[PDB]
Amino acid sequence: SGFRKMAFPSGKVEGCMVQVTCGTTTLNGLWLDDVVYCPRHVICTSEDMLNPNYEDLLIRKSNHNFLVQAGNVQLRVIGHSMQNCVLKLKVDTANPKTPKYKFVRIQPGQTFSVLACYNGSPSGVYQCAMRPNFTIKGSFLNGSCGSVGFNIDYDCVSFCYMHHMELPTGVHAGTDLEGNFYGPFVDRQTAQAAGTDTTITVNVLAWLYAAVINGDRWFLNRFTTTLNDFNLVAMKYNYEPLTQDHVDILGPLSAQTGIAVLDMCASLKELLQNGMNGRTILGSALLEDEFTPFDVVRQCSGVT
Amino acid sequence: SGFRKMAFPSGKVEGCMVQVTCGTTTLNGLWLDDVVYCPRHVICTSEDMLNPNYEDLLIRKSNHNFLVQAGNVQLRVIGHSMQNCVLKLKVDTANPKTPKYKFVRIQPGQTFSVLACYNGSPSGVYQCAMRPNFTIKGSFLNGSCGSVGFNIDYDCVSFCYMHHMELPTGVHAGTDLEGNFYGPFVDRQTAQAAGTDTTITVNVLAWLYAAVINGDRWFLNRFTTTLNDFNLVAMKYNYEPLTQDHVDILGPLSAQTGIAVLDMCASLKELLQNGMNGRTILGSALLEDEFTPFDVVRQCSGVT
Ligand SMILES: *CC(=O)N1CCN(Cc2cc(O)cc(Cl)c2)CC1
Ligand SMILES: *CC(=O)N1CCN(Cc2cc(O)cc(Cl)c2)CC1
C-alpha cells in the first residue's frame, strides 16, 4: 500500500544524455543510435532571441561548430539538420547505451517522467503531465533545455517531450522528438499566452480510486450522478468534461473497487462543491490530477 | 523556475538490483561488489512470521538455497551470513555495475530517493523522508522488500534504507544497510506502534524559501517572532521544535532571499494559526515537509 507521485526508473535515459555546445551556448542533447537530438535554439545568441531566423542562423554553422560530449568523451559530428524546432546531429558513433525506443507525441492529460539534466549530466527525475493548455509544470533552470520526458513500457522507452522554454508565468513549453511544440508555443522570446489550465477530470477520478484502494474512504458518499449532471459541475470548476471514453478507461478501477464510475463522479462533485473541510486524501489537501488511470493500475499492481 | 518533489536519477541503483529467492519467498537484493544484501525475512515462510527465530531458521539454509538472479543470469552463492536484520550473500562475481557507494544511517528529517523494485526489476522512483517517528510514507506492494533508499553526491551513492515492512497503518519500516531498523520496529508480524508523526519544521521553512524563490509570496507578512515564541506554536501543531542549528542550516536560503529566518518563522506561525484560506504554495494546499534546506538549494541551483 501507499501512493506516491512516482517517476519511471531513469537509467535507460541517463545513458542517452550528452552535452551540446554551439558557439557560446550549452544545453542537453539526447543521443540515440548515431543521432543527437537537441533544441534548435542552441545556435542562438541572447541578441537573436526576440525573432531568430533559424534557417539563416544555421547557415553560418558547420558540423565542427556543434561540440557534443558524452561524459568526458567527444563525439565527432558528421551531419546536421533541422527538423521543426529540433536539431539532429549525426555522429560517427552509435550510442552503445541506446535502449529500445520510440518517439511518441502524447495527448494532453497523459503523464511522463522528466530527467532534468544540466551540461549533459542528470540532476533529478520527477513525474508530470502534459496540461490541457499544452504546458508542463516542471522544474527547469538555465541549462536544462534538451532534458527529455519519457514513458517506459517494460524495456522500450517512449520519448515524448524535449524541454525548450519557460514562459513568464513559470510554466514550461517544449516539443515532441520530431521538434513540434506541444501547443501554440514558438521558440522565440515573445509574449506567449498560456491558456486556461483546466483540471484533468479522468485523472482526478483515477486518483480517487487509488485513494479508496489505499484506505482513504472519507469522501465516499450515498450519492450518484449522470455524465451530463457531473459535467455541469465540471464546467463550473474548470474541469475537463468527462466523456464515455473516460468512463470506459476507469472501468478496471471500477471493477477492482466495486464503485461505479458515476458514484465516484458524485463523490468528486461533492468534493468540488464543498471542499476537503481541512481533511486530506493520499497526503494531499487538493484534488490530484497528474495520475492517469493507467498510472494508478500500474502502481497498485507493481508493473516493472 | 518551478519546484518539484524530485528524486535522484536511479541508474546507478538499477544496476545493483537483483532478485533473491529462498525456498518459496522472493524479494529484492542489492548487489554491491561480491555481496548481495537483502532482508533476512526472505528465509521465512508465512507460518513462521508471528515470532521467527531467525538464527534457527537460517541454520536450515545453505548457500545453494539462496537463488540470486541479476536480470536473466544466475549468481553463484559462496557464502551467507546474517548482520542484524539483513542477509549478506557472498557471490563469486563482483557486480560490474557497482557504483562508488557508502552505507549511511540517516537522521529523522533527512530525505532520500526510493527505487521501488519487484522480482529484482525496477518499477519506479520517488522521493521521501525518514519521518520523526522513523517510518517512511512510501509505495510498496508485496515483493517490494529489499528495495533501497539512497542519496547521490556527484558519483557516490549513499545507501540509507532497505525496505522490510508495512505496518497495519499503511506506513513503512525498514533498516539501514547494516540491518538495523530505523525506529523501534522489529521484523515480526506483531502489533507495532508508529509514534506521533510530527512535521519537520526546518524542511517546511526550507520549502517556504523555495516558494519565495519561485514566485509564491502571498504568505509573507509584516511580522517577526523569536525561537521560543515560534516553538510554542510548533508544539501546539505537532511540529518539531526549531533549534539554532536549524536556523543556521537555513542561513544560505535566508542569504539568497534576504528574508531573515525568524521572519519566515512568523509567516509559518500565521499559516499554522490561520490555514491557507483556500490558496496554494508551490502547487500544494498543505505545508510540505519532505524537502530539506539542502534539497531546496540543490534544486534551485541545478547540482548534477
Ligand atoms: C531551458 C534552457 O536551458 N534555456 C532557456 C533559456 N535560454 C534559451 C531561450 C531564451 C529565450 O529568451 C527564449 C527561448 Cl525560446 C529560449 C537558454 C537555454
Ligand atoms: C515488502 C515485501 O515484499 N514483503 C512484506 C510482507 N511479507 C514479509 C513479511 C510478512 C510479515 O507478516 C511481517 C514481516 Cl516483518 C514481513 C512478504 C514480503
Check which CATH number belongs to the domain holding B212 and give it.
1.10.1840.10
State the distance between the two ends of chain B, measured CA to CA, in whole angstroms. 16
Cell triple for residue A262?
458515476
Selected residue of B117, B139, B148 to mutate for chain A interface (largest A Cβ count, 10 A): B139
* Residue A175 shares a structural domain with residue A107: yes
Residues B206/B295, Cβ–Cβ less than 8 Å: yes
**Which residues face A157 on adjacent strands?**
A101, A152
For atom 6 of ligand 1, the residue with the nearest CA is A142
Determine whether the interchain pair A4/B139 forms a contact, defined as Cβ–Cβ distance below 8 Å: yes
Chain A residues with CB under 8 Å of B301 CB are 141
The CATH number of residue B138's host domain is 2.40.10.10
Question: Would you say the C-alpha torsion A186, A167, B300, B110 has a positive or negative sign?
Answer: negative
H-helix or E-strand containing B86? strand B86-91
Determine whether the interchain pair A14/B15 forms a contact, defined as Cβ–Cβ distance below 8 Å: no
Taking the centre of ligand 1 as the mean of its atom positions, its distance from the CA of residue A116, in whole angstroms, is 15
Determine whether the interchain pair B275/A275 forms a contact, defined as Cβ–Cβ distance below 8 Å: no
Distances (CA, A) of B273 to A166, A277, B233, B269, B276: 35, 16, 8, 6, 10
Chain B residues with CB under 8 Å of A273 CB are none
Q: Which residue, of B69, B99, B129, is where some domain finishes?
A: B99
Distances (CA, A) of A191 to A20, A135, A258, B67, B71: 27, 15, 49, 61, 50
Q: How far apart are CA A146 and CA A86, in angstroms?
A: 9
* Residue A58 shares a structural domain with residue A111: no
* Residue A33 shares a structural domain with residue A150: no
Residues B110/B17, Cβ–Cβ less than 8 Å: no
**Domains contained in chain A, number:** 3
Q: How far apart are CA B205 and CA B198, in angstroms?
A: 15
Report the greatest alpha carbon distance in chain B.
69
* Residue A133 shares a structural domain with residue A210: no
The CB of B299 under 6 Å from ligand 2? The reply is no
* Residue B5 shares a structural domain with residue B141: yes
Q: How far apart are CA B61 and CA B80, in angstroms?
A: 9
Say whether B124 sits in a helix, a strand or coil: strand
Query: Structural domain of residue B296, as residue ranges?
Result: 198-301
C-alpha dihedral (A140, A146, A150, A155), degrees to nearest 10: -130
**CB-count exposure of residue B196 (10 Å: 0-12, 13-18, 19+):** exposed
Distances (CA, A) of B60 to B16, B55, B233: 28, 9, 56
Q: Give one word for B159, left, alpha or beta, with left for phi > 0 and alpha for psi -120 to 50.
A: beta
Residues B120/B70, Cβ–Cβ less than 8 Å: yes
Closest alpha carbon within chain B to A123 = B304
Selected residue of B13, B16, B118, B125 to mutate for chain A interface (largest A Cβ count, 10 A): B125
Residues A179/A85, Cβ–Cβ less than 8 Å: yes
Residue A237 to chain B, least CA–CA distance (Å): 14
**Which residues face B161 on adjacent strands?**
B149
- State the CB neighbour count (10 A cutoff) for residue A93: 13
Q: How far apart are CA B298 and CA B92, in angstroms?
A: 39
Q: What are phi and psi of B143, to 5 degrees?
A: 100, -10
Q: What technique was this entry resolved by?
A: X-ray
* Residue B110 shares a structural domain with residue B237: no
Q: How far apart are CA B115 and CA A176, in angstroms?
A: 27
Cross-chain CB nearest to B119 (options A10, A299, A304): A304
Q: How far apart are CA A52 and CA A46, in angstroms?
A: 10
Q: How far apart are CA A18 and CA A72, in angstroms?
A: 10
Chain mean position to CA A253: 23
Q: How far apart are CA A188 and CA A201, in angstroms?
A: 32
Of B16, B22, B145, B265, the catalytic one is B145
